[PDB]
């Protein structure tokens, strides 16, 4: 039986990840309804988003497997409602960096969310209903940006309608996910029948560069996507010129998933493939921010964003397929979650030197510039690596 567990956690990945106030956040926070300056956005509240997703990543991954499952979705659910109830009814630097705290828990029973598949679901169906229920995401995040899109750039819709659109949707989907089945077994504590359990699957000498790769683009991406709407709100007022941010942002999870199902089906020879276009896709991809950052038209950075994500995704795609070769159940959540812990670090540390407000205080146009040259540091390894 795979029908109705499979369509219940369809339902509600389409009715949860459909969020409209996505694109449309960064004007919302700056707005005429929350009297917040752009300093006080960047460098005060964003980055302890980041802290609430170090320090709850190891407990609520312990929260992922012992009660099976079903009171993280309920506590996801909760923090939806609290998030979207304080971002109605929240002004300040201190209910904000509530909402942050709550998003960063929201981030982490995320990775809770993705591995209810295998643990409800036979394994004759693990992969075909893995990759529907990331299609549905997806496309619900699609459709909901293109929604925010046809009701706020032709509609003439307010923002505050806005996020009560959103508060909505994760109403219904707080009701949808009440009405999930309880797994009464697990993946690791509950399961059907450290010290020396690690240095097995880490006794590798291209693993560890695949994973370590993996975990500097993946806290670079994270802070790219932290601050990409601020450069948006910088390069074009939101008060003064037209944006058009769902449009853009839908197109690039449209080209996103483009992307993925372009490397979906690579039949292309491995011989000398693996040392030519990781260094290709590097130097686009700082390109792409060295574009973003030179520019003063906001259409060249729209375009920019939807390059570097597209790059980004390819790249990333091509890294999960590459890791994922000789790795069982659980050991593949297992070091992806030991990699994220890693790339959490390594954010934490560039955003507490970089970004955070105890420390340098930079503006958001230098940022860019600091990951730009972040990504010339890994194109430049990437290119050392080639000429061995
Ligand atoms: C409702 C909300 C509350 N707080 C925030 N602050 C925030 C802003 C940008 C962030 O960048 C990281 C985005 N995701 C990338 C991987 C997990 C998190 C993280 C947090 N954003 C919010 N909306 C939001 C803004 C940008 C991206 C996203 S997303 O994570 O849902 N992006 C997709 C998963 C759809 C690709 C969501």
């Given at each position: 039986?795979?029908?109705?567990?499979?369509?219940?956690?369809?339902l509600?990945?389409?009715?949860?990840?459909?969020?409209?106030?996505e694109?449309?956040?960064?004007?919302?926070?700056?707005?005429?309804?929350?009297?917040l300056?752009?300093?006080?956005i960047?460098?005060?509240?964003?980055?302890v988003?980041?802290?609430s997703?170090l320090?709850?990543?190891?407990?609520?991954?312990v929260?992922?497997?012992?009660?099976?499952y079903?009171?993280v979705?309920?506590?996801?659910?909760?923090?939806?409602?609290?998030?979207?109830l304080?971002?109605?009814?929240?002004?300040?630097?201190?209910?904000?960096?509530?909402?942050?705290?709550?998003?960063?828990?929201?981030?982490?029973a995320?990775?809770?969310?993705?591995?209810?598949?295998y643990?409800?679901?036979?394994?004759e169906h693990y992969?075909?209903?893995?990759?529907?229920?990331?299609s549905?995401?997806?496309?619900?995040?699609?459709?909901?940006?293109?929604?925010?899109?046809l009701?706020?750039?032709?509609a003439?819709?307010?923002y505050?309608?806005?996020?009560?659109?959103?508060?909505?949707?994760?109403?219904?989907?707080?009701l949808?996910?009440?009405?999930?089945?309880?797994?009464?077994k697990?993946?690791?504590?509950?399961?059907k029948?450290?010290?020396?359990?690690?240095?097995?699957?880490?006794?590798?000498?291209r693993?560890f560069?695949?994973s370590?790769?993996?975990?500097f683009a993946?806290?670079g991406?994270?802070?790219?996507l932290?601050?990409?709407?601020?450069?948006?709100?910088?390069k074009?007022?939101?008060?003064?010129?037209?944006?058009?941010?769902?449009?853009?942002?839908?197109?690039?999870?449209?080209?996103?998933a483009?992307?993925?199902?372009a490397?979906?089906?690579?039949?292309?020879?491995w011989?000398?493939?693996?040392?030519?276009?990781?260094?290709?896709?590097?130097?686009?991809?700082?390109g792409?921010?060295?574009?973003?950052?030179?520019?003063?038209?906001?259409?060249?950075?729209?375009?920019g964003?939807?390059?570097?994500?597209?790059?980004?995704?390819?790249?990333?795609?091509?890294?999960?397929?590459?890791?994922?070769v000789?790795?069982?159940?659980?050991?593949?959540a297992?070091?992806?979650?030991?990699?994220?812990?890693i790339?959490?670090?390594?954010?934490?540390?560039?955003?507490?030197?970089?970004?955070?407000?105890?420390?340098?205080?930079?503006?958001?146009?230098?940022?860019?510039?600091?990951?730009?040259?972040?990504?010339?540091?890994?194109?430049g390894?990437?290119?050392?690596?080639?000429?061995?």
């Amino acid at each position: 039986s795979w029908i109705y567990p499979t369509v219940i956690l369809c339902l509600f990945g389409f009715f949860s990840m459909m969020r409209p106030s996505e694109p449309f956040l960064i004007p919302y926070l700056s707005g005429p309804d929350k009297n917040l300056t752009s300093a006080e956005i960047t460098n005060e509240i964003f980055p302890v988003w980041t802290y609430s997703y170090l320090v709850l990543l190891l407990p609520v991954f312990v929260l992922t497997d012992y009660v099976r499952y079903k009171p993280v979705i309920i506590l996801q659910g909760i923090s939806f409602i609290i998030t979207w109830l304080l971002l109605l009814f929240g002004q300040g630097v201190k209910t904000m960096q509530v909402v942050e705290f709550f998003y960063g828990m929201v981030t982490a029973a995320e990775v809770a969310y993705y591995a209810y598949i295998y643990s409800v679901v036979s394994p004759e169906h693990y992969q075909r209903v893995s990759g529907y229920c990331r299609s549905v995401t997806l496309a619900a995040y699609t459709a909901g940006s293109v929604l925010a899109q046809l009701l706020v750039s032709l509609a003439n819709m307010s923002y505050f309608y806005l996020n009560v659109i959103s508060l909505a949707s994760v109403s219904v989907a707080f009701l949808f996910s009440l009405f999930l089945p309880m797994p009464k077994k697990s993946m690791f504590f509950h399961a059907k029948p450290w010290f020396q359990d690690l240095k097995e699957c880490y006794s590798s000498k291209r693993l560890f560069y695949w994973s370590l790769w993996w975990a500097f683009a993946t806290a670079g991406f994270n802070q790219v996507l932290n601050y990409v709407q601020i450069l948006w709100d910088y390069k074009a007022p939101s008060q003064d010129s037209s944006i058009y941010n769902g449009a853009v942002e839908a197109i690039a999870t449209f080209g996103g998933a483009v992307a993925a199902f372009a490397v979906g089906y690579v039949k292309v020879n491995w011989d000398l493939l693996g040392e030519l276009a990781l260094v290709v896709f590097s130097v686009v991809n700082a390109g792409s921010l060295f574009l973003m950052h030179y520019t003063a038209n906001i259409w060249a950075c729209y375009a920019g964003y939807l390059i570097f994500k597209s790059s980004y995704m390819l790249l990333i795609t091509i890294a999960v397929f590459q890791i994922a070769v000789n790795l069982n159940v659980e050991r593949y959540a297992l070091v992806f979650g030991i990699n994220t812990f890693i790339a959490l670090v390594i954010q934490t540390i560039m955003t507490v030197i970089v970004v955070d407000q105890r420390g340098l205080n930079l503006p958001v146009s230098i940022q860019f510039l600091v990951y730009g040259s972040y990504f010339a540091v890994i194109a430049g390894i990437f290119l050392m690596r080639s000429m061995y």
